[PDB]
């Protein structure tokens, strides 16, 4: 007989962050909205016709 055991394997496994996916509201934007209307439309020059 040959004594000294057979063989036994270690428990060890590789690791990864799985390309995981979540929500982001901030990622959906790069630009701001244009301004409101700064201009008068009511004014009249009061000509006596």
């Amino acid at each position: 007989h040959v004594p000294g055991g057979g063989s036994v394997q270690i428990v060890y496994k590789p690791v990864d962050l799985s390309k995981v996916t979540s929500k982001c509201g901030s990622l959906g934007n790069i630009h701001h909205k244009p301004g409101g209307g700064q201009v008068e439309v009511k004014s009249e020059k009061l000509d006596f016709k």
Partner: protein
């Protein structure tokens, strides 16, 4: 007691209203010497510029207050071209805000109309020409005329 300066135009009409120690000669001479002053200028068509009232009774005052007694007093009522500067002030003050339509929504929210608002301003644009025409020295040709001296 209207702040427009009476140098700025020409009298058309006057009423004097005396009370207390006044006699009618003294008044006739007060009026004639104001009439003489053509600096106290009348519209060049008016001849008989004055009306005159004379009461025997003096003004009494209220007791303890700011108004004190006199032996004689005068009120006066006078129509004059010089007030066309204050009507022009009421033009300019209207025109500056109405060009913007400022405060309009308060009046038009009582259902009053923008049409009537504009006619009121148009009636006062006619009023400016009403004061201006009485201000004309009865011109009826292409210039004016004079004798040797005024």
């Amino acid at each position: 007691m209207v702040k427009c300066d009476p140098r700025h135009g020409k009298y058309m009409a006057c009423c004097l209203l005396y009370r207390g120690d006044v006699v009618p000669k003294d008044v006739n001479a007060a009026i004639a010497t104001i009439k003489t002053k053509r600096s106290i200028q009348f519209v060049d068509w008016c001849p008989t510029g004055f009306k005159v009232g004379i009461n025997y009774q003096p003004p009494t005052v209220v007791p303890g207050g700011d108004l004190a007694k006199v032996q004689r007093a005068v009120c006066m009522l006078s129509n004059t071209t010089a007030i066309a500067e204050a009507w022009a002030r009421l033009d300019h003050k209207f025109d500056l805000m109405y060009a913007k339509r400022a405060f309009v929504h308060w009046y038009v929210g009582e259902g009053m109309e923008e049409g009537e608002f504009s006619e009121a301003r148009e009636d006062m644009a006619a009023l400016e020409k009403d004061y201006e025409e009485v201000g004309v020295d009865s011109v009826e040709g292409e210039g004016e005329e004079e004798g040797e001296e005024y």
